[PDB]
Design a binder for this molecule. Structure first.
Ligand SMILES: COC1=NN=C2N=CC(NC(=O)c3c(F)ccc(NS(=O)(=O)c4ccccc4)c3F)C=C21
Length: 260
């Protein structure tokens, strides 16, 4: 049962992940794995207990569209080990290497992400940071959402979140908004507000609902039913946003209505 990986079994290697909440290495433990080391310079119980409580959340997930949790380490450092996704993150495809997907593919990526999110929500889990960098595209066909719950993602924040108004702005619908931005990513191929170069103004405007994604860049072959759904997920008033079962429904419908 329990998923604690004993010292020295894992083998950390080439480095990739930077930043806070930890560093990510490609490693080996029963095959290629990813290892994220929280690098919190040795807790500090019960931080050691706050960590275990997050691993409790991960282990509630078992779905092809949710990144596979394989286990966690406490021995050398605190660390979380997942399947190693072969391929690139969605952010990398769209914005770094400018991969051009068939609209059919684009809808399917959208469908899958919605699928995995519906699931996370079904199991009462709020991502709190959906965005293309966290949607890994494995063997270049399957979606793997990872990376759970304030600078690298203001583009995906719903207004209620941006204008840090109360304790918990985070909600299924705050996710649905982030979903709505990655929909804009898929369909426009761009990031939102590319023409405003001052990040503070963005934060200010988006929070007051003066600013919002210019939906008139959805590339021509974007189904109107998609463009409409995109706009529905982006509603400035969070209560007007669909939840994922319905989002999924609309995507599945406009999907089967397409190839002919
Ligand atoms: C270039 O970077 C990469 N190329 N291939 C990769 N394959 C896996 C990668 N894993 C990760 O980035 C990674 C991790 F190592 C531990 C935890 C979480 N998320 S978490 O802790 O939020 C979590 C979410 C869902 C299920 C379990 C844990 C991660 F997202 C990174 C890759």
């Amino acid at each position: 049962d329990d998923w604690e990986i004993p010292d020295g079994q894992i083998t950390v290697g080439q480095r990739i992940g930077s930043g806070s909440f930890g560093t990510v290495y490609k490693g080996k433990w029963h095959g290629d794995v990813a290892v994220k080391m929280l690098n919190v310079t040795a807790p500090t119980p019960q931080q050691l207990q706050a960590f275990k409580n997050e691993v409790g959340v991960l282990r509630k997930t078992r779905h092809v569209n949710i990144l596979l949790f394989m286990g966690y380490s406490t021995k050398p450092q605190l660390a979380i080990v997942t399947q190693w996704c072969e391929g690139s993150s969605l952010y990398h495809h769209l914005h770094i290497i400018e991969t051009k997907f068939e609209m059919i593919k684009l809808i399917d990526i959208a469908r899958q992400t919605a699928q995995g999110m519906d699931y996370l929500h079904a199991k009462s889990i709020i991502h709190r940071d959906l965005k293309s960098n966290n949607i890994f595209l494995h063997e270049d066909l399957t979606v793997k959402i990872g990376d759970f719950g304030l600078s690298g993602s203001i583009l995906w924040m719903a207004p209620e979140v941006i204008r840090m108004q109360d304790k918990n702005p985070y909600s299924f619908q705050s996710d649905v908004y982030a979903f709505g931005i990655v929909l804009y990513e898929l369909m426009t191929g761009q990031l939102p507000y590319s023409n405003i170069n001052n990040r503070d103004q963005i934060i200010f405007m988006v929070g007051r609902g003066y600013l919002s994604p210019d939906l008139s860049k959805v590339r021509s072959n974007c189904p109107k039913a998609m463009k409409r759904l995109m706009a529905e997920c982006l509603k400035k008033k969070r209560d007007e946003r669909p939840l994922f079962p319905q989002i999924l429904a609309s995507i599945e419908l406009l999907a089967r209505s397409l190839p002919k």
